[PDB]
């Protein structure tokens, strides 16, 4: 998942697991997803289970 642009007008949109979670097709993400500032502004992360 990352934030990218589109060939149409400049509209922010995610992709991958982040996009699926934001759209609503999924309720939770269970995978090796890193915690960073960019992704922390839209979704909520739990306490890390692996440093």
């Amino acid at each position: 998942g990352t934030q990218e642009r589109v060939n149409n007008s400049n509209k922010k949109e995610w992709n991958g697991m982040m996009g699926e979670l934001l759209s609503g097709q999924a309720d939770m993400i269970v995978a090796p997803l890193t915690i960073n500032n960019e992704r922390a502004q839209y979704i909520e992360f739990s306490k890390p289970f692996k440093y």
């Binding site: 642009r5 400049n10 509209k11 922010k12």
Partner: protein, 436 residues
């Protein structure tokens, strides 16, 4: 098709009449029988009576209204009449041209003018043209402020460029003895751009308060919509010099031209109604027997009146009433206080006359591409603006703007930050370093 052109006040009727019989309608089948009427009174009663009688004794489908006053009551009355009689009306000049939101349901009244969102977009484009990213918002308790703020927010976020939007104020101009709160909260502003939005009297009072506080100085810029500017001729003394505003085109768009391009819209729309559906009924009798007069649905012509690509860049009319492709201009207050034009905006295109925006602690600096001391090999990334560690550089001859970085650039940045002076960077044209 009967079309009545009504003029109110003083206008050149001969010029309008001559221009009317100057359009080639061979490509279409309309037969635009145009009737020109001129008056001086603007009283609601006279307007309604004239509209009633003209429709009675004349098979006029569309109506074009012009005025020279500045009363929005005229526009409201025209909208109400159009809604009641189900007859299209087009306001071009004067008060009728003022844009009013939330039109009456099942109304066929359209006006020549932009909306608040378009003006906000123009302001954002102007700010991004000169690399103005730090700004604030100051809006009072007036209708439309919510839409203005929402449009500004929608844009700022949906962008790859970097904006700040330090804070947004409210400034309720109704509390007694509230001047203390207004002055206290106005002192917190620090962004060069304020983007005010209020009425004329409120704008004057706020400008006076800001001048007392300390704003409106050498390093502050104020941009306001067309509402604040109001009448260009009447410039209150409280307006700071160098105030930017976005207005409609009233100098290069004359009344003879404005009256034209509107009759063509009706003729096209009509044709489309007839051609598409093999017919275009126009059954209006005078003003009355709404059940008897307006019994059938006239919404068929609505879908055609909002799409006319004759000459005005598709001349798209929004369902609200405003046009989606207007011709706007930017006006700046000079030393003589005359509201001189600066640039033009059309189809999301900005054509400004100032490449540096001429306005103390400001000076010009000359550089030249060289070893890592100064590097100019950076034009523009996907965002379309300079990077984080680069600075604008106007390469004279053309004035294309590129990005500069390097040892000397970092030294200059640190020196400017420490000594607190502003600079504009441009490259040298003739010669490399210097020789006698």
């Amino acid at each position: 098709i009967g079309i009545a052109v009504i003029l109110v006040g003083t206008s050149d009727e001969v010029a309008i009449k001559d221009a009317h019989e100057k359009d080639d309608f061979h490509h279409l089948s309309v037969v635009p029988r145009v009737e020109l009427v001129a008056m001086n009174e603007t009283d609601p009663k006279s307007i309604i009576t004239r509209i009633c009688d003209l429709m009675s004794d004349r098979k006029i489908q569309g109506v074009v209204f012009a005025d020279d006053t500045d009363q929005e009551a005229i526009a409201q009355i025209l909208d109400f009449i159009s809604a009641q009689t189900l007859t299209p009306i087009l306001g071009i000049h004067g008060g009728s041209s003022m844009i009013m939101a939330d039109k009456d349901e099942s109304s066929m009244f359209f006006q020549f003018g932009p909306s608040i969102e378009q003006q906000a977009s123009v302001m954002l484009n102007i700010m991004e043209e000169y690399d103005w990213y730090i700004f604030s918002i100051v809006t009072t308790y007036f209708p439309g402020y919510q839409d203005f703020v929402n449009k500004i927010r929608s844009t700022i976020e949906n962008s790859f460029v970097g904006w700040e939007l330090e804070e947004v104020l409210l400034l309720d101009m109704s509390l007694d003895d509230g001047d203390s709160k207004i002055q206290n909260q106005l002192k917190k502003l620090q962004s060069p751009i304020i983007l005010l939005y209020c009425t004329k009297e409120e704008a004057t009072y706020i400008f006076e308060v800001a001048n007392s506080v300390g704003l409106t100085g050498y390093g502050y810029t104020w941009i306001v919509p067309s509402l604040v500017a109001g009448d260009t001729d009447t410039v209150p003394a409280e307006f700071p010099t160098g105030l930017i505003s976005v207005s409609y085109d009233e100098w290069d768009y004359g009344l003879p031209a404005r009256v034209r391009d509107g009759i063509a819209i009706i003729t096209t729309a009509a044709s489309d109604m007839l051609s598409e559906h093999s017919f275009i009924p126009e059954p209006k009798s005078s003003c009355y027997n709404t059940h008897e007069k307006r019994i059938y649905q006239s919404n068929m012509l609505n879908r055609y009146l909002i799409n006319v690509t004759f000459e005005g860049r598709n001349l798209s009319f929004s369902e609200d009433g405003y046009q989606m492709h207007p011709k706007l201009v930017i006006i700046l207050l000079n030393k003589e206080r005359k509201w001189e034009r600066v640039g033009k905006w059309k189809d999301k295109s900005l054509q400004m006359k100032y490449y540096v925006w001429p306005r103390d602690d400001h000076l010009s600096i000359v550089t030249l591409e060289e070893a890592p001391f100064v590097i100019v090999e950076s034009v523009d990334p996907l965002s379309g603006t300079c990077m984080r560690n680069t600075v604008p550089c106007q390469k004279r001859i053309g004035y294309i703007k590129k990005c500069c970085k390097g040892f000397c650039i970092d030294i200059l940045k640190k020196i400017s930050k420490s000594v607190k002076f502003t600079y504009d960077l441009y490259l040298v044209t003739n010669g490399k370093h210097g020789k006698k």
